């Protein structure tokens, strides 16, 4: 669909792979060990710099297994990697558990998902068109069946 | 439009609905009652298995009302449901509040949003093209100026 | 490109800007001060109402800097702003730190990213096609 130029900047850097054929995302591998204390955050280096084809972004998303089993997630999920970013890809992991969480070298601790981007042009208006939803949000449709 | 084949695998399973005509997401209904303690996570079963038309993924997203009013969210938001996944759709709910949170059968506790997928091919390079953002990230553009 | 009609409903409201030329998102500016206590949430008003071109949604996403440095994030990230919503854009910020976090007027405390929407029609089936992933999820591919 699209091309990503990848520059490795760490000996342990891995080109990400789609772990199944129909996978949305490719898993991101830590290049260094990081210990994340209870109720804190750590910054995990992926040791890669990217140039996405124009018109695409990369989302950095939480992996479901680590969330369920260790209460670890990507704190800024979905992390926005901009088309024009040329720095190192890094992942902000939060440990919401009561236990230490250790990231080892090669551990897949997030997934990257490419999405097409769409630029907005804003037009100032005195009034908007009316809809049925209108100003309803934040639970306006209820919870209970 | 696109089509989703849905198989109900639990007696309390419900076909998800778009709650307003221009809603992005369709709401996902719990099939079991689950109590989620303060500062913990619970697994909510939706009792459905999906086959999305090829080319599409499902995102499992937090509902704003429950986040604001109960500090309940989908811990892996946006949860990645792969085109090729044929298992049961499940939601990891975190309770970040100090109060017990009870999910009742039929409760709409997350939403599914269909998105088109875009597969990357990686080309490894020695150097990338330069941009004005460059390696600036993690707050490089400031907060108040 | 696509068009968003924007109505300001607060004197401090700003038209959001893409902060770099290749930025996915436009930053959302608070119009009122909000104090968010440790392990709490606050609702931040952006003072704008939108009408997106049909076929598009707005995602309200966490900014990486504030998450890393202050453990502040958008609690419902990515927040779903529906095509048919005509109310004020608001941001649910959670403070997961042990320190007070103050939002000042003008502070860019989230970003908006436009995405195209795709409406599903459900067809109920007794059986689904088989795949290689099959029922594997929640760690089925490993961590190492
Ligand atoms: O970050 C957000 C998310 C939602 N909203 C508004 C606009 C959106 O169209 C509306 C509903 O969003 P959700 O469907 O994500 N939340 P929920 O299902 O609780 O509310 P509702 O019952 O109104 O659909 O709330 C915001 O202003 N900010
Ligand atoms: O998960 C992430 C998110 C961001 N980043 C990098 C790439 C992105 O282009 C850059 C800025 O992302 P955000 O705009 O989401 N963060 P923030 O607005 O704080 O930073 P900046 O001021 O540089 O835009 O940070 C990562 O490496 N990982
Ligand atoms: O919110 C979610 C996310 C995932 N899933 C299922 C479907 C998805 O295809 C599968 C794997 O999702 P992730 O890739 O996000 N999780 P992880 O990488 O831990 O599992 P796996 O190793 O199977 O890919 O889990 C859910 O049911 N709900
Ligand atoms: Mg996975
Ligand atoms: Mg809703
Ligand atoms: Mg930014």
Name the experimental technique: X-ray
**b/e per residue, C50-64, with b = 16+ CB within 10 A?**
bbbbeebbbbbbbbb
Ligand 1 — pocket residues by CB below 6 A?
A: A 136-141; B 19, 63-65, 111; C 60, 76, 79-82, 85, 89-92
Task: Give the span between the Cα atoms of C122 and C47, in whole angstroms.
Answer: 37
Residues 6 or more apart in contact with residue B145 via CB below 8 angstroms: none
Angstroms from C126 CA to nearest CA on chain A? 22
Q: How much distance in Å is there from the Cα of B142 to the middle of ligand 5?
A: 32
Q: A137 and C84: CB-CB below 8 Å?
A: no
Pocket-testing residue among B26, B59, B62, B64, ligand 1, by greatest number of atoms within 8 A of Cβ: B64
Task: Give the span between the Cα atoms of C46 and C27, in whole angstroms.
Answer: 10
Tokens, residue A120: 């907005």
What is the pairing mode between strands B72-74 and B120-124?
Answer: unpaired
Task: Give the span between the Cα atoms of B51 and C83, in whole angstroms.
Answer: 25
**b/e per residue, C81-108, with b = 16+ CB within 10 A?**
bbbbbbbbbbbbbbbbbeeebebeeebb
Tokens, residue B126: 């020695």
Residues in chain C with CB shorter than 8 Å from the CB of A128 are: 5, 7, 49-51, 86
Asked if the structure places residue C125 within a domain, the reply is no
- Are the beta carbons of B41 and A67 closer than 8 angstroms? yes
Q: B3 and C120: CB-CB below 8 Å?
A: yes
Asked if the structure places residue B60 within a domain, the reply is yes
- Are the beta carbons of A87 and B134 closer than 8 angstroms? yes
> HSE (CB half, 13 Å, CA atoms) of C2?
19
- The dihedral through the CA atoms of C76, C64, C40, C11 has a sign that is negative
Asked if the structure places residue A75 within a domain, the reply is yes
Which chains reach chain B with 3 or more Cβ–Cβ distances below 8 angstroms? A, C
Pocket-testing residue among C16, C82, C91, ligand 1, by greatest number of atoms within 8 A of Cβ: C82
- Percentages helix, strand, coil for chain A (3-state, rounded to 5) are 5, 45, 50
Asked if the structure places residue C127 within a domain, the reply is no
Pocket-testing residue among A64, A67, A78, ligand 3, by greatest number of atoms within 8 A of Cβ: A64
Q: Is C77 annotated as a binding residue?
A: no
Which chains reach chain C with 3 or more Cβ–Cβ distances below 8 angstroms? A, B
* Nearest beta carbon to residue B133 from set A59, A84, A88: A84
Task: Give the span between the Cα atoms of B50 and B112, in whole angstroms.
Answer: 12
Number of structural domains found in chain C: 1
DSSP 8-state assignment for residue C132: S
Q: What residue owns the CA closest to ligand 2's atom 14? A: C63
Asked if the structure places residue B68 within a domain, the reply is yes
Number of helices followed by number of strands (H, E) in chain C: 1, 12
Asked if the structure places residue A110 within a domain, the reply is yes
Task: Give the span between the Cα atoms of C119 and A40, in whole angstroms.
Answer: 38
- Are the beta carbons of B115 and B59 closer than 8 angstroms? yes
CATH number at B32 reads: 2.70.40.10
Task: Give the span between the Cα atoms of C131 and B145, in whole angstroms.
Answer: 51
Angstroms from C47 CA to nearest CA on chain B? 17
Q: How much distance in Å is there from the Cα of A23 to the middle of ligand 3?
A: 9
Q: B64 and A7: CB-CB below 8 Å?
A: no
Question: Measured between alpha carbons, how far is residue C142 from residues A83, C134, C138 in Å?
Answer: 29, 15, 9
- Percentages helix, strand, coil for chain C (3-state, rounded to 5) are 5, 45, 50
Asked if the structure places residue A99 within a domain, the reply is yes
Taking every pair of Cα atoms in chain C, the longest distance, rounded to a whole number of angstroms, is 56
- Percentages helix, strand, coil for chain B (3-state, rounded to 5) are 5, 45, 50
**b/e per residue, B76-98, with b = 16+ CB within 10 A?**
bbbbbbbbbbbbbbbbbbbbbbe
Nearest chain C residue to A90 by CA distance is C64
Q: Which of B44, B75, B123 to mutate to test the interface with A (most CBs of A within 10 A)?
A: B75
Is A131 in a helix, a strand, or coil? Answer: coil
Asked if the structure places residue C76 within a domain, the reply is yes
Give the domain range for residue A64: 4-116
């Amino acid at each position: 669909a699209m091309k990503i130029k990848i520059q490795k900047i760490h000996p342990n850097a891995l080109i990400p792979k789609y772990q199944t054929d129909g996978s949305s995302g490719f898993d991101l591998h830590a290049v260094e060990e990081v210990m994340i204390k209870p109720h804190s955050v750590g910054l995990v280096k992926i040791g890669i710099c990217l140039s996405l084809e124009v018109g695409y972004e990369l989302q950095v998303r939480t992996r479901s297994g680590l969330a369920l089993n260790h209460q670890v997630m990507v704190l800024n999920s979905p992390g926005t990697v901009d088309n024009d970013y040329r720095g190192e890809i890094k992942v902000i992991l939060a440990n919401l558990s009561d236990k230490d969480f250790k990231v080892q070298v090669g551990d897949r601790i997030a997934q990257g998902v490419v999405q097409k981007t769409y630029k907005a042009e804003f037009i100032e208006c005195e009034q908007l068109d009316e809809t049925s939803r209108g100003s309803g949000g934040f639970g306006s449709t209820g919870v209970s069946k």
